[PDB]
Amino acid sequence: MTCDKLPKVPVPPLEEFIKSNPLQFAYVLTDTFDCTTRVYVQPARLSPNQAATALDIRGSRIITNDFVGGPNNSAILNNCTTGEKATWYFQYTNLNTPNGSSYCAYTCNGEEIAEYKCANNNNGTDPLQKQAVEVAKKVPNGDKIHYALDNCPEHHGCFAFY
Amino acid sequence: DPMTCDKLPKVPVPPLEEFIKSNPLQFAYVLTDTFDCTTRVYVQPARLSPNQAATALDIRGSRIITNDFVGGPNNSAILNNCTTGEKATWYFQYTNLNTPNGSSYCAYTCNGEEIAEYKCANNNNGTDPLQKQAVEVAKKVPNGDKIHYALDNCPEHHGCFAFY
Amino acid sequence: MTCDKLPKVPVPPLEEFIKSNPLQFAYVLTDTFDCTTRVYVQPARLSPNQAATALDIRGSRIITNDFVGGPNNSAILNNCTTGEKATWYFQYTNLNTPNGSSYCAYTCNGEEIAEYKCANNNNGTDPLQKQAVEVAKKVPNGDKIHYALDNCPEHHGCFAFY
Amino acid sequence: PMTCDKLPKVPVPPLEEFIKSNPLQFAYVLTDTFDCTTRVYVQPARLSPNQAATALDIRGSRIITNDFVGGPNNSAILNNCTTGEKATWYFQYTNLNTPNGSSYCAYTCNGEEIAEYKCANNNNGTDPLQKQAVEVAKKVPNGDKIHYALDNCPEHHGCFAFY
Numbered sequence: 036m037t038c039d040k041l042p043k044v045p046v047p048p049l050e051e052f053i054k055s056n057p058l059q060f061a062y063v064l065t066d067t068f069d070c071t072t073r074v075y076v077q078p079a080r081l082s083p084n085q086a087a088t089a090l091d092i093r094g095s096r097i098i099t100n101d102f103v104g105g106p107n108n109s110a111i112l113n114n115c116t117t118g119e120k121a122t123w124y125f126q127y128t129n130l131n132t133p134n135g136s137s138y139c140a141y142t143c144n145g146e147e148i149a150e151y152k153c154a155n156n157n158n159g160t161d162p163l164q165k166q167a168v169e170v171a172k173k174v175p176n177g178d179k180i181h182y183a184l185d186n187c188p189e190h191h192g193c194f195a196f197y
Numbered sequence: 198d199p200m201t202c203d204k205l206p207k208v209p210v211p212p213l214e215e216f217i218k219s220n221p222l223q224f225a226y227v228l229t230d231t232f233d234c235t236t237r238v239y240v241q242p243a244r245l246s247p248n249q250a251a252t253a254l255d256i257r258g259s260r261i262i263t264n265d266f267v268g269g270p271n272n273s274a275i276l277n278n279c280t281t282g283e284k285a286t287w288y289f290q291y292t293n294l295n296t297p298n299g300s301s302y303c304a305y306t307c308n309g310e311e312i313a314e315y316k317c318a319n320n321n322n323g324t325d326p327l328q329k330q331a332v333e334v335a336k337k338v339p340n341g342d343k344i345h346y347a348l349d350n351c352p353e354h355h356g357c358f359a360f361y
Numbered sequence: 362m363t364c365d366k367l368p369k370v371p372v373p374p375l376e377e378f379i380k381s382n383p384l385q386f387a388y389v390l391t392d393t394f395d396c397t398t399r400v401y402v403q404p405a406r407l408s409p410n411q412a413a414t415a416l417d418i419r420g421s422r423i424i425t426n427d428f429v430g431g432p433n434n435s436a437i438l439n440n441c442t443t444g445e446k447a448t449w450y451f452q453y454t455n456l457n458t459p460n461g462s463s464y465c466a467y468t469c470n471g472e473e474i475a476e477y478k479c480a481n482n483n484n485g486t487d488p489l490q491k492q493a494v495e496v497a498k499k500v501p502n503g504d505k506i507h508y509a510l511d512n513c514p515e516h517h518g519c520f521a522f523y
Numbered sequence: 524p525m526t527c528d529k530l531p532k533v534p535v536p537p538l539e540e541f542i543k544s545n546p547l548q549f550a551y552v553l554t555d556t557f558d559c560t561t562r563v564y565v566q567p568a569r570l571s572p573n574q575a576a577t578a579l580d581i582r583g584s585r586i587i588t589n590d591f592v593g594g595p596n597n598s599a600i601l602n603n604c605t606t607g608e609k610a611t612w613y614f615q616y617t618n619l620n621t622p623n624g625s626s627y628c629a630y631t632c633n634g635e636e637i638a639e640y641k642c643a644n645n646n647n648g649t650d651p652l653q654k655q656a657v658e659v660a661k662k663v664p665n666g667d668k669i670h671y672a673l674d675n676c677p678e679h680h681g682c683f684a685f686y
């Protein structure tokens with residue numbers, strides 16, 4: 036199983052992602068997205084390109100990425116700070132079930148997995164996440180994939196932010 | 198024209214949904230320099246949130262301030278700084294969400310008779326006439342002289358419309 | 362004619378300002394000092410630095426700055442709420458004439474005028490005020506200088522305050 | 524027993540005596556409004572037809588203003604510049620511009636109880652007259668509300684008399 040051979044389910048409508056807000060990454064690859072909250076934003080009223088934006092929030096820090104649909108069930112991300120581009124795919128999505136939402140996404144380095152993000156708002160109770168993670172772990176560099184929520188800063192009265 | 202911060206208008210908090218449909222907004226006028234060059238995103242409570250508090254995100258480049266909020270009496274929103282634990286009682290001077298010309302509002306929090314903070318948000322490049330008259334009224338209360346235009350000389354973007 | 366090259370008359374003795382109290386600004390640059398009454402205050406008895414204070418009063422709002430002499434006939438202001446400093450000069454003073462008092466003061470942003478206050482207590486009848494305003498308007502940013510006393514709030518029995 | 528209508532009514536000193544005292548702070552007041560407050564007196568405007576002086580009551584960034592003219596029985600009649608509301612005030616005592624500075628205590632009455640009380644000084648409350656005046660006014664009806672007005676005041680930013 037090489038990264039480029041992973042499932043690429045269709046991107047849900049943006050409204051499905053927004054109804055899921057907010058989410059937390061239960062499993063990631065690199066340490067960048069440990070202890071992170073995901074929020075999805077519609078495009079600004081006056082945005083000429085009408086791109087949506089993904090917010091990755093870690094305490095007082097935030098990574099932002101505009102995204103648009105691309106070929107082969109892909110999302111193409113534009114890093115708003117650096118202009119860096121990346122092609123992402125969904126291994127699966129399971130948004131807005133009666134037990135909440137989960138998904139797992141990935142970007143590839145040819146055959147290696149460059150980054151992995153599994154999000155949920157049900158504390159990892161979705162059976163699809165278990166299965167997806169085990170499958171992702173056996174991809175080249177999938178050894179790095181880890182539970183992302185172990186040693187996270189203490190909160191000060193907010194549920195989803197610190 | 199109301200004289201002190203305690204006497205400003207307090208319109209009903211619109212349903213969260215009206216705010217979320219306005220996402221994202223920018224702050225055209227603020228009181229302290231904390232909220233210059235800032236984009237606001239409203240977020241619904243997490244599914245498993247015990248208190249069902251919504252969250253206001255104040256995003257300035259690569260930095261974020263977060264505040265959970267819930268309804269309070271007299272059309273108040275009570276905020277909880279997610280990083281500090283610090284509480285603040287806010288009100289809306291006016292809201293004008295989701296018009297054919299977009300959304301604007303102005304919100305504030307008082308230190309008694311003075312204004313401690315002020316946030317005028319819009320997604321229509323400051324063209325709502327309500328916003329202009331709101332800013333003029335707020336400036337006249339104690340400490341209101343610090344309220345200023347918040348979007349001069351902000352950093353350059355890298356491909357994104359609403360973030361940098 | 363740029364702001365850094367405007368006239369800089371000697372700051373009169375404090376007593377001359379206090380004998381003028383209260384004044385109103387006839388012409389100002391920003392909107393801040395519209396519909397505003399100026400009162401000058403002597404240092405407190407126990408003040409170590411013996412700085413005098415300028416009070417800018419607009420309804421129930423007050424802006425306060427201690428000030429002291431600086432070089433080149435400057436007044437250095439200390440905003441009492443922030444500790445921010447600003448360097449002011451007098452374009453002219455004409456205090457305590459038989460037709461009352463007037464002056465025009467200004468603070469620069471290099472070659473631009475950042476703020477302008479022309480005060481009087483004679484309903485703007487000092488011919489010096491008209492010439493001074495005409496000169497300052499020609500300076501960069503000075504196109505914003507405007508008459509400050511149109512459509513001010515109505516009073517409830519007091520002459521100088523509302 | 525001492526009631527408000529029966530307190531001392533010393534003559535109002537000339538305005539210049541108050542202006543020479545500027546600025547003052549209130550060490551004792553009745554209502555909450557006049558805590559952490561600086562008092563500044565202003566002469567009438569040149570063009571003011573009635574020539575009423577003005578008292579300024581400044582608390583941080585907020586100012587209350589009252590024109591005043593002398594009335595009967597050593598009274599000052601105050602005109603709130605924002606409401607147009609009138610109040611008759613008196614001085615329990617004045618001690619302006621001694622070699623130890625200035626102090627006074629003034630009051631206004633709701634019949635036999637005291638509606639407001641303002642004890643000003645520019646000497647950190649060291650005038651012996653001031654202690655005595657306060658003890659007396661506290662025993663008047665409602666005078667139990669009179670308190671020290673300078674306990675937990677906001678921190679300053681380089682000015683001495685304003686914050």
Ligand SMILES: N#C[C@H](O)c1ccccc1
Pocket residue numbers: 089102110123124140152154
């Ligand atoms: N999670 C995650 C990815 O970075 C992602 C994928 C699609 C759209 C936005 C963001």
Ligand SMILES: N#C[C@H](O)c1ccccc1
Pocket residue numbers: 057058059072073155156157158159194195196243244245246
């Ligand atoms: N899992 C789960 C919660 O609903 C949750 C917790 C933190 C951030 C987003 C969502």
Ligand SMILES: N#C[C@H](O)c1ccccc1
Pocket residue numbers: 253264266274276287288304316
């Ligand atoms: N802080 C701030 C915002 O403008 C705000 C956020 C939620 C409710 C009221 C006001």
Ligand SMILES: N#C[C@H](O)c1ccccc1
Pocket residue numbers: 079080081082221222223236319320321322323358359360
């Ligand atoms: N005004 C306005 C725009 O719609 C706007 C611009 C930047 C960020 C949010 C919103």
Ligand SMILES: N#C[C@H](O)c1ccccc1
Pocket residue numbers: 415428436449450466478480
């Ligand atoms: N008018 C005016 C200025 O703010 C100013 C100038 C000199 C001294 C005090 C205040």
Ligand SMILES: N#C[C@H](O)c1ccccc1
Pocket residue numbers: 383384385398481482483484485520521522568569570571
């Ligand atoms: N000009 C003039 C008057 O004397 C005046 C009017 C209002 C405030 C200060 C002074």
Ligand SMILES: N#C[C@H](O)c1ccccc1
Pocket residue numbers: 578589591599601612613629641643
């Ligand atoms: N202190 C005090 C009162 O407010 C007052 C009394 C007489 C004159 C001016 C002001």
Ligand SMILES: N#C[C@H](O)c1ccccc1
Pocket residue numbers: 405406407408546547548561562644645646647648683684685
């Ligand atoms: N008493 C005393 C102080 O020195 C003081 C402080 C502020 C204003 C006037 C006077």
